[PDB]
From Swiss-Prot:
UniProt PTM: Phosphorylated at multiple sites near the RING domain by ATM upon DNA damage; this promotes its ubiquitination and degradation, preventing p53/TP53 degradation.
Protein name: E3 ubiquitin-protein ligase Mdm2
Induction or repression: By DNA damage.
Domain of life: Eukaryota
Residue ranges of the region described as Sufficient to promote the mitochondrial pathway of apoptosis: 1-83
Domain notes per entry: Region I is sufficient for binding p53 and inhibiting its G1 arrest and apoptosis functions. It also binds p73 and E2F1. Region II contains most of a central acidic region required for interaction with ribosomal protein L5 and a putative C4-type zinc finger. The RING finger domain which coordinates two molecules of zinc interacts specifically with RNA whether or not zinc is present and mediates the heterooligomerization with MDM4. It is also essential for its ubiquitin ligase E3 activity toward p53 and itself.
Its job: E3 ubiquitin-protein ligase that mediates ubiquitination of p53/TP53, leading to its degradation by the proteasome. Inhibits p53/TP53- and p73/TP73-mediated cell cycle arrest and apoptosis by binding its transcriptional activation domain. Also acts as a ubiquitin ligase E3 toward itself and ARRB1. Permits the nuclear export of p53/TP53. Promotes proteasome-dependent ubiquitin-independent degradation of retinoblastoma RB1 protein. Inhibits DAXX-mediated apoptosis by inducing its ubiquitination and degradation. Component of the TRIM28/KAP1-MDM2-p53/TP53 complex involved in stabilizing p53/TP53.
Effect of residue 40 to A: No effect on its ability to induce apoptosis
Disease per record: Seems to be amplified in certain tumors (including soft tissue sarcomas, osteosarcomas and gliomas). A higher frequency of splice variants lacking p53 binding domain sequences was found in late-stage and high-grade ovarian and bladder carcinomas. Four of the splice variants show loss of p53 binding.
Limits of the SWIB/MDM2 domain: 8-91
Region (Necessary for interaction with USP2): 1-92
Residues of the full protein shown: 19 to 111 of 491
Quaternary assembly: Interacts with p53/TP53, TP73/p73, RBL5 and RP11. Binds specifically to RNA. Can interact with RB1, E1A-associated protein EP300 and the E2F1 transcription factor. Forms a ternary complex with p53/TP53 and WWOX. Interacts with CDKN2AIP, RFWD3, USP7, PYHIN1, and RBBP6. Interacts with ARRB1 and ARRB2. Interacts with PSMA3. Found in a trimeric complex with MDM2, MDM4 and USP2. Interacts with USP2 (via N-terminus and C-terminus). Interacts with MDM4. Part of a complex with MDM2, DAXX, RASSF1 and USP7. Part of a complex with DAXX, MDM2 and USP7. Interacts directly with DAXX and USP7.
Species of origin: Homo sapiens (Human)
Length: 93
């Protein structure tokens, strides 16, 4: 994953915007850095992740599961996480 991906400007779709607004998000255009931070905050706030769980996020009965279309995912699979996030936004250029 190149460093530049973090600077990508994005407009989240309604479901993702709903999720972001729960952890402070105020805006309609974000950087991918912001989106990844607010998602991370959402995950740790809802205890969907822990280091004793083999690096897995459990989102089966949660908004995040509906957004991503999976009951769970590994935090090590970075490219797959970007793909899941991209289905819920539109890039700005
Ligand atoms: C899981 C937790 C430790 C709470 C947060 N992790 C730690 C980072 N290594 C990871 C991450 C950072 C940047 C890009 C990616 Cl692809 C993944 C990240 C994160 O910072 N945001 C975010 C969002 C989602 Cl949906 C999944 C995983 C993450």
């Amino acid at each position: 994953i190149p460093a530049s991906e973090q600077e990508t400007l994005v407009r989240p779709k309604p479901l993702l915007l709903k999720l972001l607004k729960s952890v402070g998000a105020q805006k309609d255009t974000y950087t991918m850095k912001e989106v990844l931070f607010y998602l991370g905050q959402y995950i740790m706030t809802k205890r969907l992740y822990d280091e004793k769980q083999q690096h897995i996020v459990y989102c089966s009965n949660d908004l995040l599961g509906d957004l991503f279309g999976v009951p769970s995912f590994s935090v090590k699979e970075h490219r797959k996480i970007y793909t899941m996030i991209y289905r819920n936004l539109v890039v700005v250029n």
